[PDB]
Design an enzyme around this catalytic site. Structure first.
Site, PDB file in Angstrom:
ATOM      1  N   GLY A 159     -23.093 -95.859 -41.740  1.00  0.00           N
ATOM      2  CA  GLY A 159     -23.588 -94.485 -41.580  1.00  0.00           C
ATOM      3  C   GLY A 159     -24.996 -94.462 -41.041  1.00  0.00           C
ATOM      4  CB  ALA A 160     -26.927 -92.337 -39.189  1.00  0.00           C
ATOM      5  N   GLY A 161     -29.028 -92.926 -41.630  1.00  0.00           N
ATOM      6  CA  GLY A 161     -30.048 -92.318 -42.450  1.00  0.00           C
ATOM      7  C   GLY A 161     -30.866 -91.328 -41.649  1.00  0.00           C
ATOM      8  CG  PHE A 165     -36.915 -92.838 -38.401  1.00  0.00           C
ATOM      9  CD1 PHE A 165     -37.292 -94.157 -38.207  1.00  0.00           C
ATOM     10  CD2 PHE A 165     -37.105 -91.943 -37.360  1.00  0.00           C
ATOM     11  CE1 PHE A 165     -37.872 -94.563 -37.016  1.00  0.00           C
ATOM     12  CE2 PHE A 165     -37.688 -92.350 -36.171  1.00  0.00           C
ATOM     13  CZ  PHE A 165     -38.071 -93.658 -35.999  1.00  0.00           C
ATOM     14  N   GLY A 166     -33.139 -94.392 -39.661  1.00  0.00           N
ATOM     15  CA  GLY A 166     -32.612 -95.748 -39.860  1.00  0.00           C
ATOM     16  C   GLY A 166     -31.116 -95.691 -40.059  1.00  0.00           C
ATOM     17  CB  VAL A 186     -26.314 -96.070 -44.379  1.00  0.00           C
ATOM     18  CG1 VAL A 186     -25.864 -96.503 -45.767  1.00  0.00           C
ATOM     19  CG2 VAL A 186     -27.283 -94.899 -44.474  1.00  0.00           C
ATOM     20  CE  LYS A 199     -31.738 -92.489 -46.354  1.00  0.00           C
ATOM     21  NZ  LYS A 199     -31.669 -91.212 -47.120  1.00  0.00           N
ATOM     22  CG  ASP A 229     -24.552 -81.405 -49.115  1.00  0.00           C
ATOM     23  OD1 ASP A 229     -23.626 -80.567 -49.032  1.00  0.00           O
ATOM     24  OD2 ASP A 229     -24.648 -82.382 -48.343  1.00  0.00           O
ATOM     25  NE  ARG A 268     -20.260 -85.103 -46.296  1.00  0.00           N
ATOM     26  CZ  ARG A 268     -21.575 -85.246 -46.385  1.00  0.00           C
ATOM     27  NH1 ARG A 268     -22.297 -84.282 -46.923  1.00  0.00           N
ATOM     28  NH2 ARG A 268     -22.165 -86.329 -45.906  1.00  0.00           N
ATOM     29  CG  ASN A 269     -22.831 -85.512 -50.594  1.00  0.00           C
ATOM     30  OD1 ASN A 269     -23.021 -86.490 -49.887  1.00  0.00           O
ATOM     31  ND2 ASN A 269     -23.282 -84.312 -50.275  1.00  0.00           N
ATOM     32  CG  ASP A 273     -27.702 -85.537 -51.041  1.00  0.00           C
ATOM     33  OD1 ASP A 273     -27.005 -85.484 -50.004  1.00  0.00           O
ATOM     34  OD2 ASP A 273     -28.660 -84.759 -51.243  1.00  0.00           O
TER      35      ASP A 273
HETATM   36  C1  LIG Z   1     -27.672 -96.277 -49.741  1.00  0.00           C
HETATM   37  C2  LIG Z   1     -27.775 -95.020 -50.387  1.00  0.00           C
HETATM   38  C3  LIG Z   1     -28.990 -94.318 -50.429  1.00  0.00           C
HETATM   39  C4  LIG Z   1     -29.081 -93.079 -51.080  1.00  0.00           C
HETATM   40  C5  LIG Z   1     -27.964 -92.501 -51.694  1.00  0.00           C
HETATM   41  C6  LIG Z   1     -27.982 -91.289 -52.423  1.00  0.00           C
HETATM   42  O1  LIG Z   1     -26.959 -90.937 -53.015  1.00  0.00           O
HETATM   43  N1  LIG Z   1     -29.180 -90.661 -52.589  1.00  0.00           N
HETATM   44  C7  LIG Z   1     -29.387 -89.577 -53.402  1.00  0.00           C
HETATM   45  C8  LIG Z   1     -30.464 -88.741 -53.107  1.00  0.00           C
HETATM   46  C9  LIG Z   1     -30.773 -87.647 -53.910  1.00  0.00           C
HETATM   47  C10 LIG Z   1     -30.031 -87.351 -55.049  1.00  0.00           C
HETATM   48  C11 LIG Z   1     -28.962 -88.179 -55.399  1.00  0.00           C
HETATM   49  C12 LIG Z   1     -28.178 -87.875 -56.547  1.00  0.00           C
HETATM   50  F1  LIG Z   1     -27.925 -88.946 -57.245  1.00  0.00           F
HETATM   51  F2  LIG Z   1     -28.780 -87.007 -57.316  1.00  0.00           F
HETATM   52  F3  LIG Z   1     -27.015 -87.329 -56.196  1.00  0.00           F
HETATM   53  C13 LIG Z   1     -28.664 -89.286 -54.574  1.00  0.00           C
HETATM   54  C14 LIG Z   1     -26.766 -93.210 -51.654  1.00  0.00           C
HETATM   55  C15 LIG Z   1     -26.657 -94.432 -50.990  1.00  0.00           C
HETATM   56  N2  LIG Z   1     -25.499 -95.133 -51.023  1.00  0.00           N
HETATM   57  C16 LIG Z   1     -24.431 -94.971 -50.239  1.00  0.00           C
HETATM   58  N3  LIG Z   1     -24.454 -94.302 -49.086  1.00  0.00           N
HETATM   59  C17 LIG Z   1     -23.328 -94.211 -48.369  1.00  0.00           C
HETATM   60  N4  LIG Z   1     -23.340 -93.549 -47.230  1.00  0.00           N
HETATM   61  C18 LIG Z   1     -24.495 -92.861 -46.615  1.00  0.00           C
HETATM   62  C19 LIG Z   1     -24.063 -92.757 -45.159  1.00  0.00           C
HETATM   63  C20 LIG Z   1     -22.577 -92.472 -45.285  1.00  0.00           C
HETATM   64  O2  LIG Z   1     -22.378 -91.156 -45.806  1.00  0.00           O
HETATM   65  C21 LIG Z   1     -22.165 -93.491 -46.324  1.00  0.00           C
HETATM   66  N5  LIG Z   1     -22.182 -94.765 -48.782  1.00  0.00           N
HETATM   67  C22 LIG Z   1     -22.173 -95.442 -49.930  1.00  0.00           C
HETATM   68  N6  LIG Z   1     -21.046 -96.015 -50.380  1.00  0.00           N
HETATM   69  C23 LIG Z   1     -19.861 -96.074 -49.768  1.00  0.00           C
HETATM   70  C24 LIG Z   1     -19.021 -96.741 -50.565  1.00  0.00           C
HETATM   71  N7  LIG Z   1     -19.677 -97.098 -51.664  1.00  0.00           N
HETATM   72  C25 LIG Z   1     -20.933 -96.646 -51.548  1.00  0.00           C
HETATM   73  N8  LIG Z   1     -23.286 -95.541 -50.662  1.00  0.00           N
END
Ligand SMILES: Cc1ccc(C(=O)Nc2cccc(C(F)(F)F)c2)cc1Nc1nc(N2CC[C@H](O)C2)nc(-n2ccnc2)n1
Length: 279
Positions: free
Chosen positions: A22-24, A26-27, A29, A44, A137, A141-142, A155
């Protein structure tokens, strides 16, 4: 350094990035591995050239994720802040996001299993709201699903697409995002879970959804849905913010329904769209 007080600093030698998932902001994932035998992680990154605001937001995100410690909130493994690129590292779930998960598993779970997922989501949201964090949000999906069917609120950022059909009227109309607008979204998530990931409002456009809501229409009951569950989601969709249940009320009701499971046997009437006549 105080922002990262609940986080563990991970050394870069412990992290291997394997594939872009995925995409962050500014970077990118990545899906990767963490050595601390190895553990799969999501990573990320904040890539070279990030702005001051991007750095503040990135480390702020890491800091709050480290603060959260709850069974139904995504787990932060740690952060790389002392080296470039900086990284936020979380747990990884092979089952992935709840929306796609349910759509690929249509009809495979019991009512009790589905309601249990909702209780977990609600417990995570109660925790966030009590911690004074407004999600903004909340949608299937989240939410990540682990191998025990435990749902973890996350998120991933906007898909950025504005999620009108998950958002409470006051948040759309005047930007009032609170834990009570998150309750509206939770009601939509309840409908997503009980329908195995159907699109809220089907083919209605965003404008048509808002017009329907303003005119008083609400999503109809899912098929095979317990009466108490539809009643609860309907109360999450009250126009008047102050009339909606708080997350503490939602958690309490879902827990009581699960613990007295005969309560879930009474089903709401489903309105059929199509009539089939046979002898
Ligand atoms: C690396 C990473 C960084 C941050 C977050 C995140 O939640 N921050 C957040 C921020 C504010 C409030 C909350 C709160 F907790 F409150 F809700 C949470 C989740 C992931 N981790 C992650 N990101 C993805 N992504 C991102 C791009 C695509 O959508 C896929 N996919 C998986 N992944 C897939 C299968 N197993 C895991 N993990």
């Amino acid at each position: 350094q105080a922002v990262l007080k609940f986080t563990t600093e991970i050394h870069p030698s412990c992290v291997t990035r394997q594939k872009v998932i995925g995409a962050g902001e500014f970077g990118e994932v990545y899906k990767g591995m963490l050595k601390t035998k190895e553990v799969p992680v999501a990573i990320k990154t904040l890539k070279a050239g990030y702005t001051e605001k991007q750095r503040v937001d990135f480390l702020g995100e890491a800091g709050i994720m480290g603060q959260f410690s709850h069974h139904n909130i995504i787990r932060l493994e740690g952060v790389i802040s002392k080296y470039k690129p900086m990284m936020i590292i979380t747990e990884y779930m092979e089952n992935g996001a709840l929306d796609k998960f349910l759509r690929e598993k249509d009809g495979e779970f019991s009512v009790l299993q589905l309601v249990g997922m909702l209780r977990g989501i609600a417990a995570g949201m109660k925790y966030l709201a009590n911690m004074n964090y407004v999600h903004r949000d909340l949608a299937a999906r989240n939410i990540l699903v682990n191998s025990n069917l435990v749902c973890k609120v996350s998120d991933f950022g906007l898909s950025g697409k504005i999620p009108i059909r998950w958002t409470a009227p006051e948040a759309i109309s005047y930007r009032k995002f609170t834990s009570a607008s998150d309750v509206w979204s939770f009601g939509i998530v309840m409908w997503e879970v009980m329908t195995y990931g159907e699109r809220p409002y089907w083919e209605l456009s965003n404008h048509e959804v808002m017009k329907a809501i303003n005119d008083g229409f609400r999503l109809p009951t899912p098929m095979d849905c317990p009466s108490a569950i539809y009643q609860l989601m309907m109360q999450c969709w009250q126009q008047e913010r102050a009339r909606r249940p708080k997350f503490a009320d939602i958690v309490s009701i879902l827990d009581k329904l699960i613990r007295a499971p005969d309560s879930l046997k009474t089903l709401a009437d489903f309105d059929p769209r199509v009539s089939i006549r046979l002898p």
